[PDB]
Amino acid sequence: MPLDPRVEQFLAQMPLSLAEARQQFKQGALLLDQMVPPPPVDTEDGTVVTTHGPVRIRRYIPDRLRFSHPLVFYHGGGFVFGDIDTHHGLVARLCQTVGATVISVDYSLAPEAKFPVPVAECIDVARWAAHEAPGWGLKPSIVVAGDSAGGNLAAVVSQRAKDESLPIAAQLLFYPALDMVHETPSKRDFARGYLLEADAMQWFGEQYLRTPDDVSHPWASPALSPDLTGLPPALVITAEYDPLRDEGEAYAEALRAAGVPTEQIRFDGMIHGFMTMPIFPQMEAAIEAVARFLERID
Ligand SMILES: CCCC(=O)Oc1ccc([N+](=O)[O-])cc1
Ligand SMILES: CCCC(=O)Oc1ccc([N+](=O)[O-])cc1
């Protein structure tokens, strides 16, 4: 199916120290937010004590609370880039459109922290949120969410939840990375030219993982886990022209066949990252998909 027209234009107009590349990634996100300002939203900064140190968070409070579970959101950026500010545009809209409290998490970035530190941190924040939820007038079961690398973290947290005594009501995976071991057709075919590229993904893995053997670890590659029974209800959103598409859709099919309530939505003509790119109407359509999915959770 053809590239979305606006996506095609964006790709057509596209043209370093670690610090410079981080700043560049942040300038890119600010630019998009200037083009399509986020909705106003009440927020409160805070810090969660985790097993790997303090982790900054931002709690988003909807104008009108309509959803009975807190969302815990883990930003993407290949485990190296991104923060609460880069993902504000998405989180503010999730909060106001769903009508949910959202905890946005500033987990520790690679290469300064390596696998599996961010996983641990993200588990700890999820547990904190479950504990706090009654004091917010909410159910203790949380919804975890993330894009890309953040979708990886949401998926892994979801797999660890029962063993970690963590009540999780649902998982929202936005074009997640899930399998660092296997080539898929999409990973081969869309490896260059669609914003997320092969060589970038290799580099991210080099920064995040301790050794190449870590690719086979289920906390890096959750798609490898043989038993998906009993995992939380899943919304899995993919982009058609995304190297990560195929592993996302395959994981959704495996969840479904393991009896997990699963909604799988591919946005045709779209690319990786579209849910933090408000120049595309499909970002808000996907956020509407989230609200409609969460309506069904109870
Ligand atoms: C937001 C982008 C997330 C991303 O590309 O994360 C990845 C990190 C490593 C691998 N890999 O080693 O294959 C893939 C994705
Ligand atoms: C996508 C695979 C990336 C990978 O193999 O990551 C690493 C490679 C080499 C080292 N190392 O030996 O330091 C660590 C991770």
- Is residue 148 annotated as part of the catalytic site, yes or no? yes
Instruction: Give how far the C-alpha of residue 123 lies from the chain's centroid of Cα atoms, to the nearest Å.
Output: 14
Return the best residue to mutate from 87, 201, 209, 211 for the ligand 1 pocket (most ligand atoms within 8 A of CB).
Answer: 201
Q: What distance in angstroms lies between residue 204's CA and the mean position of ligand 1's atoms?
A: 6
| Helix-helix angle 149-160:117-132, to 10 degrees | 70
Question: Ligand 1 atom closest to Cα of 152?
Answer: 6
Calculated CA dihedral for residues 113, 119, 125, 128, nearest 10 degrees: -130
Which CATH code, of 3.20.20.150, 3.40.50.920, 3.40.50.300, 3.40.50.1820, is assigned to 5-295?
A: 3.40.50.1820
CA dihedral sign of residues 66, 30, 202, 207: negative
In 3D space, the residue among 121, 139, 131, 133 whose CA is nearest the CA of residue 219 turns out to be: 121
Which parts of the chain are beta strand (E)?
42-50, 53-61, 71-74, 102-106, 142-147, 168-174, 234-241, 262-271
Calculated CA dihedral for residues 274, 275, 280, 281, nearest 10 degrees: 140
Q: What distance in angstroms lies between residue 214's CA and the mean position of ligand 2's atoms?
A: 8
In angstroms, the CA 199 to CA 108 distance is 23
State if residue 148 touches ligand 1 by the CB under 6 angstroms criterion.
yes
Ranges of each domain in the chain:
5-295
Resolution for the entry shown, Å:
1.8
- The order of strands in the sheet holding 53-61 is 42-50, 53-61, 102-106, 71-74, 142-147, 168-174, 234-241, 262-271
Identity of the amino acid at 63: D
Return the best residue to mutate from 152, 204, 245 for the ligand 1 pocket (most ligand atoms within 8 A of CB).
Answer: 204
Method: X-ray
Under 8 Å between Cβ of 28 and 87: no
Instruction: Give the total residue count for the chain.
Output: 298
